A paper describes a structure:
Isoniazid (INH), a successful frontline TB drug for more than 50 years, targets the NADH‐dependent 2‐trans enoyl–acyl carrier protein (ACP) reductase [name]. This is a key enzyme in the Mtb cell wall synthesis pathway and does not have a human orthologue. [name] inhibitors are known to modulate the tertiary structure of the [name] protein binding pocket, in particular the substrate binding loop (SBL). Herein we describe the screening of such a library, in comparison with other fragment sets, against the highly validated [name] (Mtb) target [name].
Similarly, as a result of the deconstructed fragment 34 retaining the binding pose of 45 (pIC50=8.1)14c as well as occupying the same pyrazole binding pocket as fragment 9, compound 47 was synthesized. 47 showed good [name] activity (pIC50=7.3) and maintained the pose relative to 45.
Numbering used by the authors:
A (entry chain H), B (entry chain B), C (entry chain D), D (entry chain F): 2 to 269
Write the structure that this text describes.
Amino acid sequence: AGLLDGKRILVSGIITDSSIAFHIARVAQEQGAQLVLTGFDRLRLIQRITDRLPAKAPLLELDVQNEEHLASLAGRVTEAIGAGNKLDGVVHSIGFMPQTGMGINPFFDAPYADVSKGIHISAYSYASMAKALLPIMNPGGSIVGMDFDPSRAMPAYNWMTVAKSALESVNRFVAREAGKYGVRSNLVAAGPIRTLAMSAIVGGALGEEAGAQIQLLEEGWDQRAPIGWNMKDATPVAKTVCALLSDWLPATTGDIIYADGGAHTQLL
Amino acid sequence: AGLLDGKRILVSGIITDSSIAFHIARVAQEQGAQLVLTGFDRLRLIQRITDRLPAKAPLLELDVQNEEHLASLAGRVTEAIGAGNKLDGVVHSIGFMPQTGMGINPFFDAPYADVSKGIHISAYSYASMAKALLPIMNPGGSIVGMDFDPSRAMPAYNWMTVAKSALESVNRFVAREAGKYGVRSNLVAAGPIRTLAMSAIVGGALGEEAGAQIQLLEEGWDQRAPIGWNMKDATPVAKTVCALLSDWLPATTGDIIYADGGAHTQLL
Amino acid sequence: AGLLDGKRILVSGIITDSSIAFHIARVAQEQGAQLVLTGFDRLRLIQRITDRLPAKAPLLELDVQNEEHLASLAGRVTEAIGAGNKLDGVVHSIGFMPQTGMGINPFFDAPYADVSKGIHISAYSYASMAKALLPIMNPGGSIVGMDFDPSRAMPAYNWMTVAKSALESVNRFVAREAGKYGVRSNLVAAGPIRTLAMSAIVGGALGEEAGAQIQLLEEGWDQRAPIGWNMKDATPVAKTVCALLSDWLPATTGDIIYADGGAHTQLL
Amino acid sequence: AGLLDGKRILVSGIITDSSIAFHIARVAQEQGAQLVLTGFDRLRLIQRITDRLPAKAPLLELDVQNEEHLASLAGRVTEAIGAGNKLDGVVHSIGFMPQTGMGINPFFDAPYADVSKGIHISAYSYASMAKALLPIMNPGGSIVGMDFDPSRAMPAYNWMTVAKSALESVNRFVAREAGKYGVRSNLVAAGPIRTLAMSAIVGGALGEEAGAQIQLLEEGWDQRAPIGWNMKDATPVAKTVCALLSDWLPATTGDIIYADGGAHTQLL
Ligand SMILES: NC(=O)c1ccc[n+]([C@@H]2O[C@H](COP(=O)([O-])OP(=O)(O)OC[C@H]3O[C@@H](n4cnc5c(N)ncnc54)[C@H](O)[C@@H]3O)[C@@H](O)[C@H]2O)c1
Ligand SMILES: NC(=O)c1ccc[n+]([C@@H]2O[C@H](COP(=O)([O-])OP(=O)(O)OC[C@H]3O[C@@H](n4cnc5c(N)ncnc54)[C@H](O)[C@@H]3O)[C@@H](O)[C@H]2O)c1
Ligand SMILES: NC(=O)c1ccc[n+]([C@@H]2O[C@H](COP(=O)([O-])OP(=O)(O)OC[C@H]3O[C@@H](n4cnc5c(N)ncnc54)[C@H](O)[C@@H]3O)[C@@H](O)[C@H]2O)c1
Ligand SMILES: NC(=O)c1ccc[n+]([C@@H]2O[C@H](COP(=O)([O-])OP(=O)(O)OC[C@H]3O[C@@H](n4cnc5c(N)ncnc54)[C@H](O)[C@@H]3O)[C@@H](O)[C@H]2O)c1
Ligand SMILES: Cc1cc(N)n(Cc2nnc(Nc3ccn(Cc4c(F)cccc4Cl)n3)s2)n1
Ligand SMILES: Cc1cc(N)n(Cc2nnc(Nc3ccn(Cc4c(F)cccc4Cl)n3)s2)n1
Ligand SMILES: Cc1cc(N)n(Cc2nnc(Nc3ccn(Cc4c(F)cccc4Cl)n3)s2)n1
Ligand SMILES: Cc1cc(N)n(Cc2nnc(Nc3ccn(Cc4c(F)cccc4Cl)n3)s2)n1
């Protein structure tokens, strides 16, 4: 049967059909999973997109910055999957950093209010989500988050790299808490993916240099990667999240699995 | 419709039914894989152990230190799986370090001839095996090897830790070579497993202190592991090797997946 | 004759004579450096403590959360060292995490407002300080910050570990900026030291079950440390900051130097 | 006075006036150290080179592969520095990998006899040297070895990268032993240095493709390094070894100090 056959999985972070979460949800559904989806702000738009998934799935509003949304989350999920049922998987595919903190603006010019908003959404919310959903998770369960290797500095990513460094630390502590429930907590450090936003930067939305920068990053990534890297294909990343959601990585927690073509293991 | 259905996989390193390779072979077979097994010396003695696996599998002699064994290996594998057939997976579960380099003997007292024998078997042979089998491997294939996290020094493991540090480097270069074939190369860094040598030291073979050191390591490993660690259970390790042998980790190469209960991510 | 002879160095973070910055200031002064000191809140207590240093040094108010304090900082430093003079070194020995995010309070119960305050002071302010002081720094100069190894999760440190993970990332980006000035940026990852909040008999934000855990950390640190760890001696840490402030580590930037007795390199 | 004033230091690995050890020996002597030098094979030539150092220093024969040379080493050093005197420092600047294991030959084609020779000289000998000299070292002493970051694979370096991975592991264990003597053990991970052999490759000794590979590595290194990288200047590397030989890094052992311009901390 499917790799996630009979598993109830919550998938957050679908905004467009280019979203890494859209591919995670598609592959999970193809693999037998029953999903609950969470969306933020543009809920009629998210619903129009989630309608294109292989199967029907409840859509729940979740702004990770809203305390009431988090407090009611477990209650709202239980109502959607049915009383007496628990989640076997949670996918955090949420990330945000204002333009002041990521892009063409100098590193020193990012106001802390902006950096703090980005760290809240990109790092702290991994713990928020785990706090809310662990009480309605089954033993053997899995929490997966999305990472972009922050171990070395790079142009443009700036405070998003700082936020991913914090996310990596948050994951290690979430694992400590999750373990009390028999639940694993891990990250998928993916190589660059051509989402709508990335296609817009490459296209010059923020100028020729920011575009050239992303194309240069992508070129070197495919070059270093012993098996190559196709930024236009999120399926290898989606498959890796599903591997972690499955029972096939049962002794891995507080960790990072690199779905990057093996680029991080090569210098040149 | 198991995880490795229709896959032809070579599994090296079975000596007892406690061997990590025995559990890898058992889980792979349970998951629909057609296996070729390689054994070191015994063969007749090894065959009686492989006979206890869920299904029949050809047993081939392979001493990684013997040049003729490696030269003839691909030819012998092809004969066993049938002309026109190729391997989809290779499992290197081979390791050895003489008592002089691993145990109660001081680190400075290990003669280089002994360290060299251990490095040959435990590290260099990962490249030797890849060299021999990559020409008879299919695109999308996977080479998996066994590691014991050498990133920090520890008592007793001494030169076996040094050998694993070399193994980790070898795997990153093997990935470069394997990529030319569409093949991934990765290591499963396992927590301590009660195999032949481990059960011997615990049992008192190198005295009361040495046995006590291993029991203390194991206690602390389970303590650190947010999901715990059972050194008497190789199934979580075997399942992880199968995840890497599958098509569910398609963008991971030259890497290390930690099947250690998440112990390496926790300080205390 | 001294290691920092003729060097003008700014030292932040003195509150008591137990403060790592007090020892950095003392060793730097012993080594020929001319200092400018920055203090926060209790500027009367700070002045009396700084009066105990081997030599006189101007004391300037600096709350890293106050925008005006940062905007006026370079101007105020220049006034103290004399027009036409620039800093050769900058020491960031600033850290803070509320009791909700560091201690016995559950990890999930730390409100983001508290975590954000801690990340602002402990991580973001390293960039804030570099932004303010780099325009008044000389080529060959050095920015040093204080880190506590966050690569593995641990009890009690909780969100302070998350903040140090962010600090490490901030340092790599600050190095990029500093390099444009011929200035190096590095962190000193110290072993635990009994400073104001760490205090067990007189003062301290550490009490009851948390105090028990920090005692287990202490003993563990010294056991792991091949050269031992004295939590009551900040001199080895102070000497390491001075090594980075000197011209003896001229090719090291965006890095971490561990003054921890070597504990981080040992498993057991 | 000098950074190594009154310190008795053994310096190995001088073969040409371009050798990293020649610069280490020159800077150490400039900084007040009294040295003992060890040379291999071409001792009349080594003497001619070492005659160009700022001060006279005894030259001792030491082939790290010769057991008698190691057994007699401490005795021979004591005779040179005078009875009752001990070394305060030891510099291991020894490295070798045959052309089959480093260069233009395929990674899989390196015979183990060649790899074993290279690992013996480049990694194992760090432990051999420490075994021999620790009994004649003073508390507070320092053992320093030379490294080239092997954490990521790269073209051409092949089995030398594998040997450096082993060296890094050896260092962590040597630290455990050294600590019993109050002696620190660390490695200096240097960026590429234009030694005679490097100038020969760049110049086309192993063909145009190999030259271009080295030139490309060096170009990328200077690019990533926030403070740049001059492969033609060994002084920043020599100064870093001296910082470790001094009393200014007293809490650092079993570690790696990167004298690489900060390159290893930057992706691009
Ligand atoms: N695209 C890449 O190259 C890449 C690489 C590695 C990791 N990632 C990470 O993958 C994740 C998904 O990003 P993506 O590339 O699919 O882009 P995306 O824009 O499709 O996804 C990010 C999601 O975060 C959601 N979000 C933002 N603020 C929120 C809030 N307050 N509450 C709830 N949801 C909120 C958005 O609605 C969106 O659905 C992010 O964590 C991102 O950092 C992306
Ligand atoms: N047991 C643990 O705690 C642990 C932890 C991490 C990694 N590992 C690694 O897992 C692997 C398997 O070891 P194990 O623990 O299952 O024990 P094991 O004793 O059952 O297996 C090691 C195997 O190596 C084989 N071997 C030795 N020399 C050989 C040679 N010259 N040619 C061919 N084969 C040779 C032996 O025949 C044996 O089957 C090793 O690489 C080991 O280092 C073990
Ligand atoms: N003590 C340890 O075990 C240890 C270990 C590793 C790193 N460190 C780090 O060393 C540094 C120095 O801390 P310490 O241990 O000497 O203790 P400390 O309490 O004496 O020093 C922390 C300093 O931060 C200052 N500070 C707090 N909020 C501030 C603000 N808003 N603006 C400006 N200054 C502010 C305080 O006034 C104080 O001087 C910190 O960054 C700490 O995280 C400490
Ligand atoms: N040049 C670089 O790009 C670079 C970068 C990082 C590290 N390193 C390392 O720095 C060290 C110094 O090498 P270098 O580049 O200055 O070149 P080098 O050739 O001048 O020095 C290497 C030394 O090893 C000695 N040696 C070889 N076999 C020996 C044996 N059996 N016994 C004793 N000595 C022996 C040689 O005589 C020579 O003095 C080596 O460890 C090298 O790996 C070099
Ligand atoms: C790790 C990662 C990668 C991506 N795309 N995400 C999701 C995002 N979350 N917040 C973002 N905000 C911003 C501010 C500016 N940009 C555009 C831009 C850039 F300037 C430089 C590089 C890439 C991009 Cl897309 N995106 S992007 N997370
Ligand atoms: C990482 C790992 C674990 C196991 N079982 N292997 C396979 C081996 N290959 N050669 C070995 N040789 C020897 C010599 C002595 N011992 C026993 C011992 C010890 F003294 C100290 C620590 C642990 C052990 Cl098991 N094992 S163990 N590799
Ligand atoms: C890495 C480090 C060490 C120290 N002293 N600092 C500076 C600080 N800044 N704010 C702090 N605030 C707090 C809240 C509670 N405590 C006490 C406590 C604990 F409960 C558990 C562990 C350690 C400690 Cl110290 N300190 S500590 N940074
Ligand atoms: C880490 C490091 C760098 C250097 N030069 N050393 C010292 C050496 N020890 N043995 C060496 N042997 C060999 C075999 C072939 N080459 C030439 C060559 C190459 F093919 C590829 C790259 C660089 C060079 Cl120089 N050097 S070089 N250690």
